[PDB]
């Protein structure tokens, strides 16, 4: 028994959290940790070293922003502890980690050590009454209400497709590549350098993310538009300068459909969907093609869904109704799905109790991983 389950949606770029039963996540902020770079000289300065959340975003110039999680895998656990601890601070939740069971979203095909050490972190430093690690696609489909269909997500560090059949997420059809939002921003940074504009500071990579979020689009024809000179719209920096982008705005999110530009034998998003559908039972292909759900912030580019339809039509068999849905809460899909899932009475039997974790250990988590 506890108060209420807290759905903490992780993400390599933006963490999202709130209590279960909530409508929208009330607490969302970037998943980075910024510590100052300069020298504390004057007294009365910004006290404290590590900053997370709105304060780290505000005084962005001083920090040396780093990410503790990359490609859905935690690289530094200390920064993650401070991030989770920040989630439970007075600025976000104002609660205690002893009276709340925790729903935790997590990307597929990740190492066992993520669930194991993350569970140790929660049940030991936080001592939560109940932890429950789950997928992300299952939650997104629960958020849309329907039940069978694939889920195409592309967050900040991962991207995958999961063919879900009535909740049983088919584990033998989850294609997963590691080319997501942050990497698109990284490649955009490279193209900005090729344009002439240099951005290499860690607290400037964020400006590159801002440019990706408000100045890029997806060309329908990938090559016909490359053979033309666009209008070259400008961009206003926080500094007040001006950057004319040019061709570095459509080729930047082109990476998601062709990771040859980054030099990698992986596949595009369209191939992840088509391979995820084709590596399933032939009796469900039409049902999966009639139900595609997008989620994740990288599915917010202009002309994304339209280009995805064109690509899938080029790869799907002829005269099969393809249908891509795209709800208005792609950033909040996994969190809303967590709010629906954890607010049910079956969640009591679906979690892992603290007592159980102390009895068996990590094997209990891998046992009851679904």
């Amino acid at each position: 028994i506890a108060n209420q389950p807290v759905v903490i949606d992780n993400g390599s770029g933006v963490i999202k959290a709130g209590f279960a039963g909530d409508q929208i996540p009330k607490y969302c902020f970037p998943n980075y940790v910024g510590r100052p770079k300069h020298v504390r000289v004057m007294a009365g300065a910004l006290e404290g070293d590590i900053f997370i959340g709105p304060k780290a975003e505000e005084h962005r110039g001083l920090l040396s922003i780093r990410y503790p999680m990359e490609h859905g895998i935690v690289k530094d656990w200390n920064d993650m502890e401070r991030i989770w601890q920040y989630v439970y601070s007075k600025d976000q939740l104002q609660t205690f980690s002893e009276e709340h069971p925790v729903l935790l979203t997590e990307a597929p095909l990740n190492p066992r050590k993520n669930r194991e050490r993350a569970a140790e972190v929660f049940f030991e430093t936080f001592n939560v009454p109940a932890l429950f690690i789950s997928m992300q696609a299952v939650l997104s489909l629960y958020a849309t209400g329907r039940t069978t269909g694939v889920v195409l997500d592309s967050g900040d560090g991962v991207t995958h497709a999961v063919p879900i059949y009535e909740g049983f997420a088919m584990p033998h059809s989850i294609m997963r590549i590691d080319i997501a939002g942050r990497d698109v921003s990284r490649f955009l940074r490279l193209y900005l350098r090729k344009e002439g504009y240099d951005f290499h500071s860690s607290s400037e990579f964020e400006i590159v993310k801002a440019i990706k979020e408000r100045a890029c689009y997806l060309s329908i024809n990938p090559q016909k538009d490359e053979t033309l000179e666009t209008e070259k719209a400008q961009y206003y920096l926080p500094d007040g300068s001006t950057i004319e982008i040019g061709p570095s705005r459509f080729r930047a999110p082109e990476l998601l459909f062709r990771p040859d530009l980054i030099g990698e034998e992986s596949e595009g998003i369209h191939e992840v969907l088509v391979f995820a559908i084709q590596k399933s039972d032939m009796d469900l292909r039409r049902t999966l093609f009639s139900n595609i759900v997008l989620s994740g912030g990288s599915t917010l580019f202009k002309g994304f869904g339209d280009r995805l339809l064109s690509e899938v039509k080029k790869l799907a068999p002829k005269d099969v109704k393809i249908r891509i849905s795209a709800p208005q809460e792609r950033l909040y899909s996994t969190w809303i799905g967590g709010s629906i899932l954890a607010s049910l009475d079956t969640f009591k039997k679906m979690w892992v109790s603290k007592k159980e974790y102390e009895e068996d250990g990590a094997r209990s988590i891998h046992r009851k991983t679904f």
Binding site: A43, F96, E124, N127
Partner: protein
């Protein structure tokens, strides 16, 4: 009970503040008109804020001794500090104090403003107490001080160390934590001394005494292993804390140590005395005298204090032993005379079957080998006769 300080305010400011309160309007610097420009008024304000800084420093630099004192004093100490600093910050964040700072900033007397915002350790004090608060919130040490049942004391030890497991999220000083554990052990020895003083240890029969002592050793046992678990956890934190210090002495003398040693020696007193006197329940008139030396120690054992128990009870126990020595010599010489005066070897066997458990005490057991061998040759010859007679067969 840490004192509280009511920070004064300039009465004229409160006058204009109440005037701003009679109407619906927020107080502001502009309301004083041409009074802000008064160097006398601003000098008064500077003096007042300087006094405020003095008063707050009187609370923020406060700290107690983590080594000595009861652990309860430390728990209550940190809670009282949070209360003091909480009320202090609410006095500070009031719009009147804010307006005094606004007046000094408009008067540019930055000595007062900078000293009010950086010299008081308040901002760091609130931070430190809030970092210690999860360990300090609801510390169940009263349960040891609640029930006299040794099992309740054990359960209290369990709940207390599981509550002490919370250090992983508190960053409290490990050295202060070790001293807190020793204060807990002082409470342990205190509670056990209390309970066992009420149990009437040396009075009671050997059986109830045994049950009492078993539960007490369970208490020490649970102390031991659960404390070792905390040692492991502290080393786990230390491996991430080694970057800060290495002043972790790790020397712990949990107060109940000599109480433990004392209990085991008193165990041996009840055990061994009880045994020897219980063997004399197979009987020249030193029986009651053994019980006299026994009760010599039950009286002069002074209801087992610790310090003088060492420094005086050593001779007390030893004295009892000297009386057993005389008791031995008399019993051994006595029995050797009843053995020597025994005229039959079977009679001699009856004396050996009369003191079976007395031929255990090595002291006694040494001087009988000659008689033993006499009996062995008797046994020898008779079993040899059995070889003979059985070597003749049943048909014949």
């Amino acid at each position: 009970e840490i004192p509280e300080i009511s920070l004064p305010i300039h009465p004229m400011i409160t006058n204009v503040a109440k005037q701003c309160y009679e109407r619906g309007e927020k107080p502001k610097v502009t309301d004083f008109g041409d009074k802000v420009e008064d160097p006398t008024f601003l000098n008064q304000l500077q003096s007042g804020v300087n006094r405020w800084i003095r008063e707050i420093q009187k609370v923020t630099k406060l700290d107690r001794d983590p080594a000595s004192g009861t652990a309860l004093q430390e728990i209550s100490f940190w809670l009282n500090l949070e209360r003091a600093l909480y009320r202090i910050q609410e006095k500070r964040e009031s719009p009147e104090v804010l307006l005094t700072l606004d007046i000094l900033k408009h008067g540019k007397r930055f000595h007062a403003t900078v000293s009010f915002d950086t010299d008081t350790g308040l901002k760091q004090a609130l931070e430190t107490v809030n970092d210690y608060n999860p360990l300090m919130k609801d510390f169940p040490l009263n349960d040891l001080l609640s029930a006299t049942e040794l099992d309740k004391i054990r359960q209290a030890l369990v709940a207390i160390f599981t509550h002490l497991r919370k250090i992983r999220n508190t960053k409290y000083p490990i050295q202060r934590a070790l001293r807190l554990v020793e204060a807990i052990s002082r409470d342990l020895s205190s509670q056990l001394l209390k309970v066992l003083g009420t149990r009437k240890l040396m009075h009671v029969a050997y059986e109830e005494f045994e049950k009492v002592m078993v539960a007490c050793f369970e208490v020490f046992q649970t102390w031991d292993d659960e404390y070792e678990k905390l040692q492991v956890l502290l080393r786990d934190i230390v491996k991430r804390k080694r970057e800060e210090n290495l002043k972790m002495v790790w020397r712990i003398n949990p107060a109940h140590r000599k109480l433990q040693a004392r209990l085991d020696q008193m165990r041996k007193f009840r055990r061994q005395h009880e045994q020897l006197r219980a063997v004399i329940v197979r009987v020249a008139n030193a029986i009651e005298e053994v019980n006299l030396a026994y009760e010599n120690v039950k009286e002069v054992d002074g209801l087992d204090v610790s310090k003088e128990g060492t420094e005086a009870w050593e001779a007390a126990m030893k004295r009892y032993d000297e009386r057993i020595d005389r008791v031995e010599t008399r019993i051994t010489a006595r029995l050797r005379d009843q053995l020597g005066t025994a005229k039959n070897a079977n009679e001699m066997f009856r004396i050996f079957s009369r003191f079976n458990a007395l031929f255990v005490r090595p002291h006694i057991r040494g001087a009988i080998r000659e008689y033993q061998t006499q009996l062995i040759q008797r046994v020898k010859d008779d079993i040899e006769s059995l070889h003979d007679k059985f070597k003749v067969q049943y048909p014949q």
